[PDB]
Design an enzyme around this catalytic site. Structure first.
Site, PDB file in Angstrom:
ATOM      1  N   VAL C  17     -35.636  41.466 -66.805  1.00 49.04           N
ATOM      2  CA  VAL C  17     -34.256  41.047 -67.006  1.00 49.04           C
ATOM      3  C   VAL C  17     -34.186  39.759 -67.828  1.00 49.04           C
ATOM      4  CG1 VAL C  17     -32.188  40.138 -65.862  1.00 49.04           C
ATOM      5  CG2 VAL C  17     -33.282  42.164 -64.982  1.00 49.04           C
ATOM      6  N   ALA C  83     -37.349  39.097 -56.065  1.00 51.70           N
ATOM      7  CA  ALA C  83     -38.446  39.997 -55.685  1.00 51.70           C
ATOM      8  C   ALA C  83     -38.134  41.393 -56.314  1.00 51.70           C
ATOM      9  CB  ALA C  83     -38.508  40.105 -54.173  1.00 51.70           C
ATOM     10  N   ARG C  86     -30.270  46.685 -52.694  1.00 51.88           N
ATOM     11  CA  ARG C  86     -30.240  45.293 -53.129  1.00 51.88           C
ATOM     12  C   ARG C  86     -30.121  44.297 -51.928  1.00 51.88           C
ATOM     13  NH1 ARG C  86     -27.072  48.314 -56.137  1.00 51.88           N
ATOM     14  NH2 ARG C  86     -27.486  48.247 -58.404  1.00 51.88           N
ATOM     15  N   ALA C 116     -27.823  35.993 -61.478  1.00 49.22           N
ATOM     16  CA  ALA C 116     -27.972  37.443 -61.591  1.00 49.22           C
ATOM     17  C   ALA C 116     -28.998  38.078 -60.656  1.00 49.22           C
ATOM     18  CB  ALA C 116     -28.302  37.796 -63.018  1.00 49.22           C
ATOM     19  N   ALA C 117     -29.802  37.275 -59.979  1.00 50.07           N
ATOM     20  CA  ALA C 117     -30.735  37.784 -58.974  1.00 50.07           C
ATOM     21  C   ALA C 117     -30.004  38.547 -57.872  1.00 50.07           C
ATOM     22  CB  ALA C 117     -31.510  36.626 -58.367  1.00 50.07           C
ATOM     23  N   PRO C 119     -29.514  40.073 -53.865  1.00 46.86           N
ATOM     24  CA  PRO C 119     -28.110  40.528 -53.903  1.00 46.86           C
ATOM     25  C   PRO C 119     -27.212  39.425 -54.438  1.00 46.86           C
ATOM     26  CG  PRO C 119     -28.658  39.871 -51.690  1.00 46.86           C
ATOM     27  CD  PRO C 119     -29.870  39.556 -52.536  1.00 46.86           C
ATOM     28  N   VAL C 120     -26.503  39.733 -55.512  1.00 44.81           N
ATOM     29  CA  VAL C 120     -25.974  38.702 -56.390  1.00 44.81           C
ATOM     30  C   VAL C 120     -24.837  37.893 -55.757  1.00 44.81           C
ATOM     31  CG1 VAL C 120     -24.418  40.252 -57.657  1.00 44.81           C
ATOM     32  CG2 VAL C 120     -25.287  38.182 -58.771  1.00 44.81           C
ATOM     33  N   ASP C 121     -23.942  38.553 -55.034  1.00 42.31           N
ATOM     34  CA  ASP C 121     -22.786  37.853 -54.502  1.00 42.31           C
ATOM     35  C   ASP C 121     -23.242  36.900 -53.391  1.00 42.31           C
ATOM     36  OD1 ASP C 121     -20.589  40.068 -55.796  1.00 42.31           O
ATOM     37  OD2 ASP C 121     -22.397  40.954 -54.824  1.00 42.31           O
ATOM     38  N   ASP C 146     -21.665  47.116 -63.320  1.00 41.13           N
ATOM     39  CA  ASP C 146     -21.106  48.361 -62.773  1.00 41.13           C
ATOM     40  C   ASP C 146     -19.865  48.755 -63.538  1.00 41.13           C
ATOM     41  OD1 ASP C 146     -22.869  48.686 -60.285  1.00 41.13           O
ATOM     42  OD2 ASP C 146     -22.018  46.621 -60.105  1.00 41.13           O
ATOM     43  N   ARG C 149     -20.981  50.200 -66.804  1.00 38.40           N
ATOM     44  CA  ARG C 149     -21.444  51.558 -66.525  1.00 38.40           C
ATOM     45  C   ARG C 149     -20.274  52.518 -66.355  1.00 38.40           C
ATOM     46  NH1 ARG C 149     -26.096  49.151 -62.519  1.00 38.40           N
ATOM     47  NH2 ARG C 149     -27.792  49.341 -64.043  1.00 38.40           N
ATOM     48  N   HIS C 173     -21.401  43.828 -55.369  1.00 36.62           N
ATOM     49  CA  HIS C 173     -22.301  44.632 -56.196  1.00 36.62           C
ATOM     50  C   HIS C 173     -23.316  45.269 -55.282  1.00 36.62           C
ATOM     51  CE1 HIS C 173     -24.803  45.794 -59.597  1.00 36.62           C
ATOM     52  NE2 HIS C 173     -25.817  45.067 -59.170  1.00 36.62           N
ATOM     53  N   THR C 227     -34.543  48.323 -64.061  1.00 38.75           N
ATOM     54  CA  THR C 227     -33.378  48.341 -64.936  1.00 38.75           C
ATOM     55  C   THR C 227     -33.281  46.983 -65.530  1.00 38.75           C
ATOM     56  OG1 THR C 227     -31.406  47.391 -63.884  1.00 38.75           O
ATOM     57  CG2 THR C 227     -32.271  49.346 -62.926  1.00 38.75           C
TER      58      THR C 227
END
Lengths: 315, 315, 306, 306
Positions: C17, C83, C86, C116-117, C119-121, C146, C149, C173, C227
């Site tokens: 990423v 790591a 999510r 952006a790592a 779980p993001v929220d 998302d 997408r 997310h 991804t």
């Protein structure tokens, strides 16, 4: 080699401020590889061609030159910006005949050259001259495209954008109809980042209804304001023409408001009028039909009606 | 409609880090409208295709998909990044036979599809595989192009740029020859904003001759350094491939160092080797022949000679 | 005064990423300096000098293997270090977070955090808590990807440029995210209105479309291991909006101060962003069904935070 | 800290050049704010709102009719205000200069002056003198445009992208300027070496090519009244190099402190430019003939300054 067809060519007819600015926009953004400029004033076109060439070392390459109608043989795109202005004391019907005479002497030599591309029309009155261009050229409906209300829409979006303090690209609102006095805003589907104008006003009641009405009126009169202030308007339309050109030449399937042929949409027929449409390398693919309110549909009808009466009379 | 040909299509063969990054670069910069990805690992290509699709709402549109060789029928561009690495204990001749077997099973189905475009080759050893691709495809010399020393040249320019603290786009210096150990710098014509390296050193004698020699050696060994540090190299070559693609697809007549066929230039014949060339929609137009010093010409000869001995043996 | 026209990004985490994000920034000529920070000091040197090779074909940049102390004068700190659900990564990634934010703040960093790592929220909230920065200068990618997408999915279906398709995914997310069909549209025409005009499009197709979007990460990992192109591109888009002061509307992880009846969490919603971070939070008027989804997503999210 | 990621240009002079420059900046998304200042307050309002219509198709910008006081916090002040030989305009344009630089400095402006009004090398010097700014923060377009013309001219002849053609015009912008054939090249191959390989190209053609370049402004004015696209594009290029801190090499009006044996004038030569203005002045080693030309150009220029 099939890649021999990776050379894109635009013939621009009309080298006033609009055409000249359109050419500059195309140069700066590196759209198309060849621009031929055609105008009755041969000296002026030579002048622009070689002034624009000086920009190329700072941008992508292009063949730019003063051109003839015969140079359209292999053009992808013919852009018409040459319309005679309405003199005081002429009727709209007269403006239309004066311009049909001219438009004939462009479209006929262009077709005769072998041109087999897309006509993009921006000369005023644009929805009428777009129809005319279709009639005179014999090209398919969907390969004759007018700028229509793209510019008014941009003006409308920027206007809203300033008010709410947001990037105009996140503002989605249309002006539809005939480009000119009978055009109208589509408030019902206008939104900012998905939130509708109705919903936005509810959240922000400081925004009074009369402000929104004035905002549209100002948009409709913006050309007049600009001409009052500086003599002519050109940056907006030039930019819009470049946008449309890019959408065709890069096969984008972009949605834009444009002069397109009505085959039943909105209860209209056999005229070009401004509405959202999907456009790509082959011209118009789809015509989006926005479900209008009763008020909005009336406006569309009135706009189409006066427009249609003028077309019929003109032929 | 002639504008039906305004849709550009690239078939990418090989979806390793290089191919994948090339696809991403093409997406980000909005070059071409269609990318088909072909690789023996069908799952990996599906994976990349749909990961890359997520980027499109932030860039221009593209049709991106996992493809087959038959999808090249109407492609403008076939980019080959699929080469088997040299295993320890293989000779260069063996690396070459192993890769010719593979390259055959790509080029033959591609030609059979009806592909009538340009081959862009980046698989290693690139100047050999470029020749092979020409031999196996039967395409004209000038429609088979290798990345050659474009990447080494970029490395060389950036290296000089850092030293003198200048935008690398204002630094003009080449690496020529076979991409690999026998490549060499063309110091005689290297310059910064027109001022030659010789002239620059005279003005700035802090810059010692040995520094410049090390700078080149480091460039020649840069791939090895990168692989030591992170396993593979890909951003540089991907970017170079995109640059070359843009030059072809926008018909630029750009000068770039590339693997091109020698028909007498530098006293060389019947090999592909790296030199500055003019490229456009129809592939190679001109091969620039830099007047080399005696030392420099010797290096070119040595590079060409070992290269040629390997080609002959391989067929 | 023009001495301040030098933009600097410190990127933390040099996996696929972060590496792709850096490449995107290079290719599109966003920012003039990128420092790359990661545990693996060799890998970051490797990427820095591989990326430098692209610069002669783009605009100039100072790119280098960096330390947390290099963030002193950065405009932007982008955190991608995770790591490899999510949510099943939460504790492993908080541990890593902890070791990053403190040295960054201690350097003097006085910019914007972009997180952006996964779980993001949650990690966005964490980053706010650990950093002590204002709410609006800590931003998570949230449901930007998302949403992209979703737009692209629709775009393919109706054969239209995704930039003319306007539809959101909101919420946390991950699995509890949801589509906002009520306001989704193509060139202004809503999805409801579109289906009416094109009844070939069956209702179950649209449901599948969203389910496929929600599972897209898993599909991609199944196919190719990880991804990265999507999120990298989104991060570049967000970076551009900040660094060019755009006032752009994007779906992002932002702090809830009452919106949707929510409080004291970061969650994904449309927001206006510029050089000073979050300016406005747009509050989409949701249907009952949609609001339910937002509530469930937020509830479950708040539980995990504890 | 990101509060400083807002770039502002004050443009003085809204003729065809200034107006085109503004358009170029809009189209290429350079800077986030443009203030337009001119005697004719209606015309500047007119351009501002005509240019705004382009923004929905590009990046955002604040564009408005401005006053000299609006330069307080500008990054960049661009002076295009001239009367309509380029030397025959000197006194008319100094009078206008005088009325501009003082109110700009008095506003608190602490950025870079970019000068394009003719005669440019003289007005650049004037601008330095009147402003009291450092030498390297007062920059004239100089021979950037002539160089572009020269490159394009060559490019057409040899059928090559002008970006692969490297050739300078140096000296005072105007009649005493001269080509630097000694270092001119195409993709590294010098003009001398090129002619040897392509003897179809006669020596008299090259001489005509340069003469045509030197007279190009006059040709354009003869044909269409004024010239503007070239210089506008060059000004945008220079602005981008400053605002993105490029360290780009460009031919510009810069202060001579010994270079070429010259002193205490601004004259056109290759220079390195970045966010802080001029960093280096490149001193091309000229032939005897070329150095003579530079001397004559500088001599005649210094006489006129007095």
């Amino acid at each position: 080699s099939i890649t021999d067809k990776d050379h894109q060519k635009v013939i621009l007819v009309g080298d006033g401020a609009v055409g000249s600015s359109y050419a500059y926009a195309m140069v700066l953004q590196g759209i198309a590889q060849e621009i031929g400029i055609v105008d009755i004033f041969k000296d002026k076109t030579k002048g622009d061609a070689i002034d624009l060439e000086d920009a190329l070392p700072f941008t992508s390459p292009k063949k730019i030159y003063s051109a003839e109608y015969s140079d359209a043989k292999d053009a992808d795109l013919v852009v018409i910006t040459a319309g005679a202005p309405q003199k005081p004391g002429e009727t709209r019907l007269d403006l239309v005949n004066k311009n049909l005479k001219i438009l004939k002497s462009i479209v006929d030599p262009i077709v005769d050259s072998g041109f087999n591309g897309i006509f993009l029309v921006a000369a005023n009155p644009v929805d009428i001259l777009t129809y005319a261009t279709w009639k005179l050229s014999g090209f398919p409906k969907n390969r004759v495209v007018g700028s229509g209300t793209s510019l008014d829409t941009a003006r409308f979006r920027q206007s809203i954008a300033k008010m709410v303090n947001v990037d105009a690209r996140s503002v989605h609102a249309y002006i539809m109809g005939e480009h000119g006095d009978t055009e109208f805003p589509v408030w019902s589907h206008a939104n900012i980042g998905g939130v509708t104008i109705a919903e936005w006003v509810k959240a922000h009641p400081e925004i009074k209804e009369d402000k929104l009405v004035k905002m549209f009126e100002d948009v409709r009169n913006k050309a007049y304001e600009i001409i009052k202030l500086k003599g002519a308007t050109f940056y907006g339309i030039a930019t819009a023409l470049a946008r449309i050109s890019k959408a065709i030449l890069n096969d984008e399937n972009a949605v834009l408001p444009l002069s397109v042929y009505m085959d039943g949409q909105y209860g209209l027929n056999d005229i070009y009028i401004g509405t959202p449409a999907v456009i790509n390398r082959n011209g118009i693919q789809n015509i989006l039909e926005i479900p209008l309110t009763d008020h909005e549909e009336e406006s569309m009808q009135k706009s189409a009606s006066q427009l249609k009466k003028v077309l019929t009379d003109a032929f």
